[PDB]
Symmetry: C3
């Protein structure tokens, strides 16, 4: 253990740390890119479900009215004083409550983390005077 | 390269490392908060889909029965010995198989990672005696 | 501040760094495992929605045709030259556009990050000659 060895070991530590830093930045950048894709996927399929549900209600409405008009035509033909089958109630779908994913705070945070990691690099210039 | 320079460089390395540590903790904490929001979003929209599907089957059931009762009334009026259009089969929806997201192991793990990072901080007290 | 103290402090720094490294690997491995579960969950529920939507269109088709056949039987009984209620249009559902989650690039990247972190470990063998 000499001083040359000490300062050479300092370089080993600094380089290993700088090596790890680059890996962290990649990790958090990749994590961030993944969250963006997840947010977009989840939101797209929630909007499709919400849209379908409204088109479904729109369809059931036309079916129910059509059936109602058929029952009213049966009664006219039956001449039974409206003693046939009453017009049924088909209820309604529950308004879909969808959760939209908003990871804008989290994604900007990871953007800043990678950035702060970049400020942590050990410049070999500042070592050994 | 003197000893003062060596110990001053040690402080540079330690501080840069402590600087990076804080960034890692933020990164994994933010990642954890994001996963919680993703889990809640995915699960909420899967429960909405599952609920809709059951209300849809409930609606188709009332429609099919109503149509069946209309056909039976047509036959009575037609007096053709039941030679009109038979009552159609409208099948049934496939039971929705939804996947619920359970990231409780993963989220507790990230909680522990941030915690273990905190145990890795270099206290300047232990340097230079 | 002696040389023994300098090299002992080097060990403290190296060990603290190696300690943090293990935590990073756990963090990015856990993050990766979580993304896999998210991808599988999101995709499974998108396929269920897509399947339901097709079975819904298949059901509406049989309902509409059945209603059309009922109207045509009403007209035959009414003998009014087809002056009753016309056959209604029930439209069609919009083809569901679902987004499938493909995080294969991102998940292989995190696999490599953990791996590159492993190459950053400071082996105490290379210190102090």
């Amino acid at each position: 253990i000499t001083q040359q060895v000490l300062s050479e070991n300092q370089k080993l530590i600094a380089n290993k740390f700088n090596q790890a830093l680059g890996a962290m930045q990649t990790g958090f950048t990749t994590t961030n890119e993944a969250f963006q894709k997840v947010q977009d996927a989840v939101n797209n399929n929630a909007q499709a479900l919400s849209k379908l549900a409204s088109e479904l209600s729109n369809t059931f409405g036309a079916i129910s009215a059509s059936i109602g008009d058929i029952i009213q035509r049966l009664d006219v033909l039956e001449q039974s004083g409206g003693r046939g089958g009453s017009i049924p109630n088909f209820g309604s779908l529950t308004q879909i409550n969808t959760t939209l994913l908003d990871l804008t705070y989290e994604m900007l945070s990871l953007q800043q983390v990678v950035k702060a990691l970049n400020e942590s690099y050990i410049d070999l210039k500042e070592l050994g005077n």
